[PDB]
């Protein structure tokens, strides 16, 4: 109560008209941080749900995503990370997402991407944006909030969701639950892999990832993971795909990426996956016109 109260409807209304004070954004970080810490690091969710991939500060595309998927609380949402960096409006993006998290804490969920770590967003845009528009102290407050984000989700005991992918260290879900917060993302280990690894159609088993961190994993790794944990699908993000979604290993894994025409280097669509109450899945594809 030491910073006073936010007027969250005012903040949301101003964000959708696309001008927050430093204390407003700080309040968004601190209150959402408390909510993240009150919920498990491995979320256990129920459908119906809309699942979204990377945003990377493309705020107008986020607004399009809500327009076509339904603004909260009309739909429930799970985002898979990478809200900031590269795009021009990381601040508006993460502020709107944190506002919805504060207002709908049981119907709106944000996972950690590899860019929700100071070691990464120091370099790829967010630090510079905070410093230009506000100050470094605000960026550090964001870091404190990011360090408490959940790292994976299981929807109805059948869909395993994370930003990056599998880990040769992941033997039990309890290993995920035992990760203590706040934490940064180290450059090796379970947490790293969940935020950084990729599927690869050419690899047999595990390979070294070209990013210089983590791993690649092949189709039999996916099949054995689903088998061992009695799951049906892995849903992850992290890699741009041409249609906004892309299947791997006979639809046992899907990659979602929600930023169209990604950072001006690609001509991709963005997509979100709609999961109804029976776990029937379909995709909504966002294509900007030329």
């Amino acid at each position: 109560g030491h910073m006073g109260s936010l007027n969250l409807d005012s903040i949301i209304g101003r964000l959708l008209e696309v001008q927050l004070t430093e204390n407003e954004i700080r309040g968004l970080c601190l209150k959402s941080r408390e909510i993240f810490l009150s919920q498990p690091i491995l979320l256990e969710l129920e459908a119906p749900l809309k699942i979204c991939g990377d945003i990377h500060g493309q705020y107008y595309d986020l607004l399009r995503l809500f327009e076509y998927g339904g603004f909260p609380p009309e739909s429930n949402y799970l985002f898979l990370g990478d809200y900031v960096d590269r795009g021009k409006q990381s601040l508006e993006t993460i502020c709107l997402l944190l506002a919805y998290k504060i207002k709908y804490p049981e119907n709106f969920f944000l996972l950690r991407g590899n860019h929700e770590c100071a070691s990464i967003n120091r370099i790829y845009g967010f630090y510079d944006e905070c410093k230009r528009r506000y100050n470094i102290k605000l960026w550090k407050t964001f870091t404190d909030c990011f360090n408490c984000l959940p790292i994976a989700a299981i929807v109805d005991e059948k869909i395993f969701c994370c930003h990056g992918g599998l880990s040769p260290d992941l033997q039990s879900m309890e290993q995920i639950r035992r990760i203590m917060r706040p934490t940064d993302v180290p450059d090796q280990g379970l947490l790293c892999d969940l935020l950084w690894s990729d599927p690869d159609k050419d690899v047999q088993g595990w390979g070294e990832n070209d990013r210089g961190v983590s791993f690649t994993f092949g189709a039999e790794v996916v099949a054995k993971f689903l088998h061992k944990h009695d799951l049906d699908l892995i849903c992850r993000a992290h890699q741009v795909v041409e249609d906004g979604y892309e299947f791997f290993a006979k639809r046992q894994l899907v990659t979602l990426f929600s930023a169209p025409n990604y950072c001006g280097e690609f001509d991709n669509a963005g997509a979100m996956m709609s999961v109804d109450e029976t776990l029937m899945c379909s995709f909504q594809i966002l294509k900007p016109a030329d």
Binding site: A47, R64, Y68, D156, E157, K158, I159, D232, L233, R251, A269, A271, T278, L279, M280, C281, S282, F283, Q284, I285, L286, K287, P288, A289, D290
Partner: peptide, 22 residues
Amino acid sequence: KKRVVFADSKGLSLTAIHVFSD
């Protein structure tokens, strides 16, 4: 106990495409 099913395996559209003005 629920099972993941993709909509085109049930004779429905797998995708909807929203083309928007940039």
